[PDB]
């Protein structure tokens, strides 16, 4: 972490639960600039007691353009099925006038009332056959009840959400100072408040923004692929949209039993005949219908924490090479400590702070920094101050020293410098 900021320790409420190690809980707010991608940003915590302190790092991983799931619906696959029970008058004894009321759920004509494998199908009578042609010897016409089924025998289910926007987002790793880590995808473009543990993060810098048309994602449950469309969506199915049946139960997205999803009026193509009704439909698949594409300064606010609470030597080992590179030179220092402790800033380091952790053994931790010349003095690392200094030549983005070909060109550049002035001086008198 090249960018590091200490805590604002003016909030002190520390209870001495044990004399040997203290306890303290605080809160507040934090303001951190965003770090370069692929890096982690540290957070120093300060305490009145000298020996002990904690830290917190946040690693970023990616930058992309996603949008939040504002809603959620499922789309099964409708098939329009229909039966027809064909009575004739004086045999079913139906009225001369067809009953305007229809119980679309019971259907007492055929086995009273039970579960209808369609979702709120329609009902109705039909025109009439009468005579010896249809056999029941009544010249009066005949009433015929018909059904319409929406069915999903082998369903393929898509989940959708109409965010209808595009806001930058990043990949964030959290590391609680106790040692616990939490991963989450915060929509840092917006002032979102992801809730986890004690702390909450929120918006960052939307250093770039871009626009796109009304598009939402279309994803399949079995995960065939990832799909995109104009993706029209609402609480009800508007005409010509991608999704007609929007059902809010995956467990009920296979069949159609849940009442949350609502049919479209006269959607099933029922048509009649002289004897019985037959099925058709005008429904449209998700594909080949409405499709335009085909996929192949972060900060956090502080809550009520659980903040926790000798000899140490630095003993550097080596230095790597960087200056003016967006990564910095990775320099290792081999330390041993009697306690699991932290390291702190070097005043003459003159670049940034340190958040080094050491176990109770001689470990080495290597960290990335850059400097034109090596100074590395005045580090208040751990337990007591120490002053160790190295000496090494930094590597900076320069020309090629391998062949020194530019040296030959440099000598040829300075040719006849005084000759031009000598000739111009003589011509200057005549020209002036």
């Amino acid at each position: 972490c090249d960018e590091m900021v200490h805590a604002d320790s003016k909030l002190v409420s520390c209870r001495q639960g044990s004399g040997n190690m203290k306890e303290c809980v605080t809160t507040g707010r934090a303001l951190l600039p965003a770090v370069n991608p692929g890096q982690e940003a540290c957070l120093h915590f300060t305490a009145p007691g000298s020996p002990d302190s904690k830290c917190l790092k946040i690693k970023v991983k990616r930058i992309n353009l996603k949008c939040k799931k504002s809603s959620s619906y499922f789309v099964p696959d409708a098939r329009s099925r229909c039966t027809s029970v064909r009575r004739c008058r004086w045999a079913g004894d139906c009225q001369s006038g067809c009953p305007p009321h229809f119980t679309s759920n019971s259907f007492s004509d055929d086995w009273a009332g039970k579960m209808d494998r369609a979702g709120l199908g329609f009902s109705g009578c039909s025109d009439g056959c009468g005579g010896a042609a249809c056999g029941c010897f009544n010249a009066a016409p005949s009433c015929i009840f018909w059904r319409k089924w929406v069915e999903n025998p082998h369903g393929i289910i898509w989940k959708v959400s109409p965010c209808a926007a595009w806001v930058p987002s990043a990949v964030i790793e959290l590391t609680m100072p106790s040692g616990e880590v939490r991963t989450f995808h915060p929509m840092s473009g917006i002032p979102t408040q992801v809730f986890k543990g004690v702390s909450v993060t929120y918006l960052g810098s939307d250093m770039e923004v871009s626009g796109l048309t009304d598009l939402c994602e279309i994803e399949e449950l079995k995960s065939k692929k990832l799909a995109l469309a104009p993706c029209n969506q609402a609480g009800m199915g508007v005409v010509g949209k991608v999704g007609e049946i929007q059902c809010s139960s995956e467990e009920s997205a296979r069949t159609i039993k849940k009442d949350g999803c609502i049919w479209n009026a006269d959607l099933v193509g029922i048509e009649l005949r002289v004897d019985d009704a037959v099925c058709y439909s005008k429904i449209t698949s998700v594909e080949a219908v409405a499709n335009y594409s085909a996929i192949p300064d972060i900060t956090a606010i502080r809550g009520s924490f659980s903040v926790n609470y000798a000899t140490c030597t630095g003993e550097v080992t080596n230095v790597s090479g960087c200056y003016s590179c967006m990564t910095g030179a990775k320099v290792s220092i081999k330390l041993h400590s009697s306690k699991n402790s932290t390291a702190h800033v070097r005043c003459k380091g003159d670049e940034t702070a340190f958040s080094v952790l050491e176990g109770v053994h001689s470990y080495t931790v290597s960290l990335s920094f850059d400097h034109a010349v090596v100074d590395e003095q005045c580090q208040l690392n751990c337990g007591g101050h120490e002053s160790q200094v190295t000496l090494k030549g930094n590597l900076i983005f320069l020309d090629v020293p391998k062949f020194v070909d530019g040296s030959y060109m440099q000598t040829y550049h300075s040719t006849v410098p005084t000759g031009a002035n000598i000739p111009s001086p003589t011509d200057w008198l005549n020209a002036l």
Binding site: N36, R62, P296, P417
Partner: protein
């Protein structure tokens, strides 16, 4: 790697699943243009990044789960904001750098006589 998007990578896969999961980036904020590619057979893969480091060790977590490669790289375009480099000097190398100036004009003088 660097600002240029093209890099040379040689990785191989030992699997037969038709479904291939994601891949990852490298250090210093990458986004590899080819994260998913069919994993049915033994097809070698070459990704592109802008890393340009020395070890250039990175990782990916779809199925490989954070392996640690090693590398060593060493000479590119010599453009730089700084000019030359600090030198020992002390009048021992500067004197050698400066040579006769009339010698260069002598060569051009001979060409003029031959042309005329």
């Amino acid at each position: 790697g660097g600002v240029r998007l093209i890099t040379l990578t040689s990785e191989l896969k030992s699997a037969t699943v038709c479904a291939s999961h994601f891949c990852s980036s490298a250090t210093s904020g990458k986004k590899s243009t080819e994260i998913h590619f069919h994993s049915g057979s033994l097809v070698g893969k070459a990704a592109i990044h802008v890393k340009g480091a020395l070890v250039d060790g990175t990782e990916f977590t779809f199925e490989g789960s954070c392996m640690f490669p090693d590398g060593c790289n060493a000479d590119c375009t010599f453009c730089r904001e700084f000019l030359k480099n600090p030198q020992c000097y002390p009048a021992k190398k500067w004197l050698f750098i400066i040579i006769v100036i009339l010698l260069g004009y002598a060569g051009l003088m001979l060409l003029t006589n031959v042309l005329k």
